[PDB]
Amino acid sequence: SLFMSLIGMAVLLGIAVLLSSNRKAINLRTVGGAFAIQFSLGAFILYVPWGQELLRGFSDAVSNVINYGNDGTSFLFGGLVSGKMFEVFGGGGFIFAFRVLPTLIFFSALISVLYYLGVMQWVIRILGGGLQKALGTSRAESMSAAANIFVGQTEAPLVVRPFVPKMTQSELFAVMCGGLASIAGGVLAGYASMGVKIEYLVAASFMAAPGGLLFAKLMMPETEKPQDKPANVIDAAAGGASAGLQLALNVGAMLIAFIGLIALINGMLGGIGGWFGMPELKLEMLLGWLFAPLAFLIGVPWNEATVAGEFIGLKTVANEFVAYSQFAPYLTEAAPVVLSEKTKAIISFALCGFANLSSIAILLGGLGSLAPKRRGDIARMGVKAVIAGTLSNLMAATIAGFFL
Amino acid sequence: SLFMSLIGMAVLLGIAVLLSSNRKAINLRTVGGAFAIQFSLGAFILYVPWGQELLRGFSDAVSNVINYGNDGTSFLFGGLVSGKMFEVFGGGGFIFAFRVLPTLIFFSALISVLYYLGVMQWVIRILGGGLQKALGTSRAESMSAAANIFVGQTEAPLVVRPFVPKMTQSELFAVMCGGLASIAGGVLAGYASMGVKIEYLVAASFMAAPGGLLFAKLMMPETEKPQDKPANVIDAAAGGASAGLQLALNVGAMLIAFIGLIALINGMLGGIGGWFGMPELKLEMLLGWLFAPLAFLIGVPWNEATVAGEFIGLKTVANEFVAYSQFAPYLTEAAPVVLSEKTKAIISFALCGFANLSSIAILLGGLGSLAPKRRGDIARMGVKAVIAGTLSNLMAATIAGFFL
Amino acid sequence: SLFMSLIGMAVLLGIAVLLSSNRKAINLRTVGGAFAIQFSLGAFILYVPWGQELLRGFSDAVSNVINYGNDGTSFLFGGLVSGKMFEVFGGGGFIFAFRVLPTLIFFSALISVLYYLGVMQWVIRILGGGLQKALGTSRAESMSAAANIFVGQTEAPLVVRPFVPKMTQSELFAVMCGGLASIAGGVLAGYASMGVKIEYLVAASFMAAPGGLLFAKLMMPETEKPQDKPANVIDAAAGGASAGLQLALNVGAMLIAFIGLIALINGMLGGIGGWFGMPELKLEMLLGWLFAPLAFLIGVPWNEATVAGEFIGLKTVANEFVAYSQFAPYLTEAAPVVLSEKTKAIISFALCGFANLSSIAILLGGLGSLAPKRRGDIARMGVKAVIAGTLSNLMAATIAGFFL
Ligand SMILES: CCCCCCCCCCO[C@@H]1O[C@H](CO)[C@@H](O[C@H]2O[C@H](CO)[C@@H](O)[C@H](O)[C@H]2O)[C@H](O)[C@H]1O
Ligand SMILES: CCCCCCCCCCO[C@@H]1O[C@H](CO)[C@@H](O[C@H]2O[C@H](CO)[C@@H](O)[C@H](O)[C@H]2O)[C@H](O)[C@H]1O
Ligand SMILES: CCCCCCCCCCO[C@@H]1O[C@H](CO)[C@@H](O[C@H]2O[C@H](CO)[C@@H](O)[C@H](O)[C@H]2O)[C@H](O)[C@H]1O
Ligand SMILES: O=c1ncccn1[C@@H]1O[C@H](CO)[C@@H](O)[C@H]1O
Ligand SMILES: O=c1ncccn1[C@@H]1O[C@H](CO)[C@@H](O)[C@H]1O
Ligand SMILES: O=c1ncccn1[C@@H]1O[C@H](CO)[C@@H](O)[C@H]1O
Ligand code: NA
Ligand code: NA
Ligand code: NA
């Protein structure tokens, strides 16, 4: 029952220690408090009444911002995003390109505005400050952790960019992990626009800040000594819109290609598999069969572990956006397999993260531009940081399933 | 009656003199003739029969070019831009993304072709030469003024780019003002595709050349001494298409974000306003209430000044593209408020200009790349140049309303 | 009958010799074997039974990959690419922007993957090696020839990029010609998605490798002495997707502008032509009237030579993508002129090539970046290389019509 979850949490911690760079250098206060916060935060907003009300209150505000932004895309694409689309095309009336992608544009502009007004820096300074006083982590790596709740892995270190070129290997690794453990505000609203419960997305985004530091300081403890703008608000929105547009195009091209490639792979796997009496062999079968123990370990029922593995596996070997796209039909009344509400929550939390191999290349570009002489260290710690980010997402899912 | 318009023209001139860098250095021949041309040009093509026929003749040619270009977008988006769209989605059958944006691509390619053939340089040389002989303005600043009738604020100085790094502060300011007072050929056809009367757009584009110089030489008189390609036609079209595409994407992202942001602001203004007994408070109400005196001053009737202020205000605090997008429904039979034909003309002229704060950043990029050591002067004169450009648009509207 | 084709082949060879840089330096083994291979390859896969089966087998595999990739665009654009589109908009239900353009994205990602796995380098090394052993051409120029079968003119030299800056003028010219004589895998599937028979596209792509070398070594014989990566597979796909997206946007903007420009030209040609009693004068009439002898020479019947000339002419003076777009309606049951199956094949082969003037600018960018000190030689040999590429496409069409 609940005993299988606590074992899950133990196993995840165990792997991180086995993969640590120095188990004897692990700060017990740091990693103890880090797990304490993520677990308590999970308990707070998923179990206790007052915490649940604050979460559903924040989520409804996020849901209101999404609808407001939809006025923009409604103007541009008109009746192609209206209700008449469902009367004509039925299910295919929902055009992903016009329904989900424009959200990335609006939210990138909004967060750009919130940075200009100092609202973002205000929240980050509070959360980032609470972490470093409780965990003993450095100032810079804690701010980047807190920022990563709302923005992406390449945008979060920007709030501490003059400290990045000279921060320690453990600091840099943590910064990498904070980005891999979390997502971004823009894609968040995208996933929400696909049917993913906002309550789970907001919850997972916040639990990423302590969770990211947790596995950063487990797998790479501090063995060194750390240290220590647009002209107007309209320009900020325009710049954010531009950045969002570029991101929207990239995600769209990736989804067309990757899905197309998976369709090509499934065709080949059917022919190759047929040679071994398995003509029905697909990529989803391999991934499900391979990740089922991992899904079963984080709290997914035995009879649903394989289907859960398909999504968790797809997120790891590609990215969370593709995983969510294949998991979204399972959130409607036209779902091929009716899953339990607890399993739906676990997958939602386990997928909520940029933790994949492709993000290393993205970290080399973004985070590497802030410190060009540190691109070697980033590439070297890349895979370890991806694993650490994966453990953080899996821990958050285990915690989530435990309190649900 | 007509007395309120002439007062309007006087007030606008008055503000420019009060904000001048040296009232004693103002060249009476320059600013006298500049106003004389803009006023006479307004009289010519809006009042006298022969001038009205030349304007409607040029506009019908512009309207024919638009339809020819529509063959391109009709090929790409097929039935999504056909008449069947209105039978199915009704009003929402008009998809802005496919109906207006592709025009920017076609017209950018066409103007690129016209530059290659020397047709553009031919017209600019005549109009630019007539201005400098009548106003006494320098050669370079006059060519940039004439070019700005047809192209954008960053493209117009390109016809005199080797003279920009060494031109006087008054010359540079004028170049900045010529761009802010006018629009571009590409967006022109876009506004026309939204229901804005082409006759008003062409008229305002031409009146921008003397009007831009007028307020440039009022607010910043000359106190110094001024001085003095693609391989084939198919390459020119391709390059122009590419530039148009990039612009089309930017405008689209901006419209999605800005409209979405306004929707978000109106939601917040309803809550904040509710604290003061004004739950119906919106951005349009603030802008209308604040710009109504200005609209009333340029010739808009008292009972229509507030609605007119909403659009003029939105153009100033954001850009003219967003203003036109909110003003276009007022040009159809489904308009929420039926406005007088004179008020519709005034708003059309007052909106026709790139005069906004965001254009300073764009001027720093485009015009600043032509003279990197002059980016300080551009940023310093930015706001003054925006005001000057605003006065030029307001003057053109007052003149327009006077002869109508 | 078949005598008119062999005359055609002779004439094409004749022009190349007349335009040669040194007729006395032409290697008879090189150009003899080069024509021998292209002619035999044509005989193999268009005439002999076994060769026809291998071609239709490869084409059905290409047709299967296309459909697999379509799962990606089907996810993004939903019902806008469904069968319901034809029930509502009829013929206009086929939206080119969503039906053809996304193919460039998928195929660019796939070929990027195939390069990473070493599959591309494996095939190129075999075909490129067979050519240089049979023709006596250099190693580098032969690999670029073989690569050009599957990829574009700027991508093909990348497999021999450290040998490009120091290769001979004849080598560089051949590299330029190999790219101009062929197309790319991505646009190939695009043309196939417009109704162009895949069998003709695959055939022409392969016959371009010897055909490109053939006219390279005729018009520019060797008079000198020649010499002699993404972190993971998912990164490769993502990079290829990005490159495909950029290309998809460019092609789309070009098609909107060029078609729009042609519509504008036809309007002007109707007025200008009206002055000489020819109000029905259009661009298609001029191009058809001017290229009809050329089409008649390559095997197109007298009564179909003029219509065939319209398409061949449009490909030359613009690009093959625009030509195919105007030729595609002639491949359906709603064709304005029912053409013979042999004429449809000839046009398909004659159009299959990047041979146009605009590609010189593209060669200056791509191939010129690999050897910046050789941009002068590229620009100098540009037009000659375009002619050579045109002759290669015309030869392939003549050969095709001969065996059909
Ligand atoms: C959808 C509608 C929303 C309604 C909200 C309207 C907001 C109004 C924006 C005004 O902001 C100002 O704009 C200036 C222009 O960019 C800035 O000056 C900046 O640039 C000037 C010159 O360009 C310099 O003089 C200054 O030093 C520099 O602060 C200045 O910082 C900024 O405060
Ligand atoms: C929709 C259909 C429209 C129908 C219209 C057809 C127009 C025909 C275009 C031909 O233009 C020529 O093309 C050359 C190739 O770019 C240019 O040579 C340029 O480039 C050459 C080599 O690339 C150099 O030899 C030259 O010096 C240099 O002028 C040359 O300037 C230009 O006149
Ligand atoms: C749609 C689903 C498809 C299913 C297929 C799944 C394929 C699995 C990809 C794994 O590939 C590895 O990924 C590493 C990470 O990029 C690479 O390490 C590279 O980068 C490392 C660090 O980033 C370095 O340690 C290495 O030196 C360097 O080889 C490595 O080369 C590569 O073999
Ligand atoms: O780096 C990112 N920043 C913002 C949004 C997205 N991504 C990247 O793109 C992917 C898809 O959302 C993520 O897994 C991540 O690697
Ligand atoms: O600078 C520009 N050049 C061409 C088109 C548009 N714009 C900018 O974008 C805005 C929207 O049309 C203008 O206000 C102007 O600042
Ligand atoms: O250079 C290219 N590489 C890949 C795809 C396309 N093109 C260019 O764009 C044109 C349209 O397919 C070609 O004629 C060619 O010049
Ligand atoms: Na993040
Ligand atoms: Na202008
Ligand atoms: Na090629």
Numbering used by the authors:
A (entry chain A), B (entry chain A), C (entry chain A): 2 to 229, 241 to 416
From the paper:
The crystal structure of a CNT from Vibrio cholerae (vcCNT) presents the first opportunity to examine specific nucleoside recognition by CNTs from a structural perspective. vcCNT is an excellent model system to study hCNTs: it utilizes a Na+ gradient for nucleoside transport like hCNTs and shares high sequence identity (36–39%) with hCNTs with particularly high sequence identity for the nucleoside-binding site (64% with hCNT1, 73% with hCNT2, 91% with hCNT3). vcCNT forms a homotrimer with each protomer possessing its own nucleoside-binding site and permeation pathway. The protomer adopts a new fold and is divided into two domains: the scaffold domain that is responsible for trimerization and maintaining the overall architecture of the transporter (light blue), and the transport domain where nucleoside binding and transport occur (other colors). Two helical hairpins (HP1 and HP2) and two unwound helices (TM4 and TM7), related by twofold pseudo-symmetry, create a bowl-shaped nucleoside-binding site at the center of the transport domain of vcCNT.
